[PDB]
Amino acid sequence: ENIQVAEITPSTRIVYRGVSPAEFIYLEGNKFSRAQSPTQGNDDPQWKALYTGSDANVSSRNITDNPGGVVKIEYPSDWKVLEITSTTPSQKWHNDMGEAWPVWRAVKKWAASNQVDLPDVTASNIDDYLLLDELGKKKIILKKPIGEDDVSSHEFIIPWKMAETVAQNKIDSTSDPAAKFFTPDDLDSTTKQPKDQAAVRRILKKWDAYSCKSLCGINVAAYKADIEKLIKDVYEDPNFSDLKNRTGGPQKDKDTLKGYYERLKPKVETLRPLKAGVSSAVGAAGAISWAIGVADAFTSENVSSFDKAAAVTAIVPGLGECVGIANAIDKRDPEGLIINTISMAALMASAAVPVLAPIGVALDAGLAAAQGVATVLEYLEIGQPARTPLPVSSPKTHKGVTAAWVGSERIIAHRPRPGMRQHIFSVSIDSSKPEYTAPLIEVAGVRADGKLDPSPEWIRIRQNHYPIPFRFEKLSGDSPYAFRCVLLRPTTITRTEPVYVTFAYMTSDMTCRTGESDPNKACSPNNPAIAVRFGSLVKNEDERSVLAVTWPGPSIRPETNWIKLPYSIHPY
Ligand SMILES: [Ca+2]
């Protein structure tokens, strides 16, 4: 057996839970209710329950969209807390932790020597004994690691019948005002979701802040005032009047931009000298290369506003080779380096982009680039120790980015019966360019209605202590049937911080069928695959173009910014 269960006695019987605005409003004046939950916490009956987190941060960063806030739950002392553990001391995670049958065996083994009577669940009759419902008849909750990519954080799984017995005064939604990310006027009463992007940005700020309440590292926002003044000081210097008064199209000549670089780098270090011994991390070749990228981005996307120009800057590839601090930063003067490198980044962009009337003068583009660059770096844990990445298999590289599977990518329909199944892949930077970076813009996957149903509640995109919002979408079309997750703030792949994507699906008795003439069509969807995009769209190529078995691929279409990972589906 791979997993085991043992009762623990926690020092604090306090869990947390991230909720949408509607649920946060509900919980302020009602108790938890299975009927009020549209999914009952999980598409899989074995797992239907109330899910909670081991601390406020884990719950905060496992909201994936439409964040409302985080509530604090105090559960009774008489509840038995059963922790799922690996039988191998080296391995803290095992995929059996997620499968109803192995877990069933593990609690049965514990119950037998601990005076708890549980049904005689078998691989045959498992459909008749739903795990969490059955533990709810016995005063049991489950403690479990969040996932293979977050083994040190844990979810507490609370059977609904017990969740419903928690008193109201034990559900805290008020003592910390920062745990409530929205105000009522931010939402539409009919949808009870944010009215507009202004609201979404406001909620995101409170969401981000709470998730790091610092756990996230350097607060890049703390230096916007300095960076803005600094850039403005440069543009008032008479020696830079040629930048200040520049009009017309972009400047992408590498000699020309190098000339600005060597005029700008010393100037920036004068306005905010770095502390003794510390040196600038900006490189000529990367800044020139990156600035050209911003200029190409400004033209192609016709930026009609400051924020549009800032957004476009945040998803330009190669920022890490220009700022030099995407993966590490000199701890002797982190503030000075942040102020120094962003300012350099934005000034170089201001020298290369076209000067578009909607933006303003060249200075305005520079300031817009600074906001964009700062947003990118804000979500990287610079200056904190680098994480050991998860081992991968079957990698595929394109334009310096690498997608690969963590563990097994196969989706088995019966294990031993249908249920919630999942696979995980990582998006990494290829180490040949150790400081390269690229945006994660969207991920997509095949589906089959009634056969392989993506579970939007349990899809996750993970990197560090920040949440990673995305919008889940079931797409139109039958060739193939597909879904996409659109990331909702600048999400950046780095060497030291790859992004982990978990896709969860429900399988059914209809996933695989017998009797078909071709053994490869026995399971739907046929030709299964996922896809990750880290650059601009190619005309007439969307996620459904790539997922299709008819996609030409990166060799025929090297301009693409997609990587496609196939996987296989099997009945048992
Ligand atoms: Ca930060």
Author numbering: 6 to 218, 229 to 587
Provide text from the study.
Moreover, each of the individual domains preserve their respective folds: the central split β-sheet motif in the catalytic domain characteristic of the ADP-ribosyl transferase (ADPRT) superfamily; the three-layered α-helical translocation domain; and, the Ig-like jelly-roll fold in the receptor-binding domain. Additionally, both DT homologs maintain the pinched disulfide loop at the junction between the C- and T-domains. By striking contrast, we found that AT and PT do not display any measurable toxicity on Vero cells even at µM concentrations.
Whereas the homolog from S. albireticuli (S.a) displays a Tm comparable to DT (46.5 °C cf. Remarkably, the T-domain of AT lacks His residues in the T domain entirely. Instead, this region (TH1-4) is stabilized by two salt-bridges between residues in TH1/TH3 and TH2/TH3.
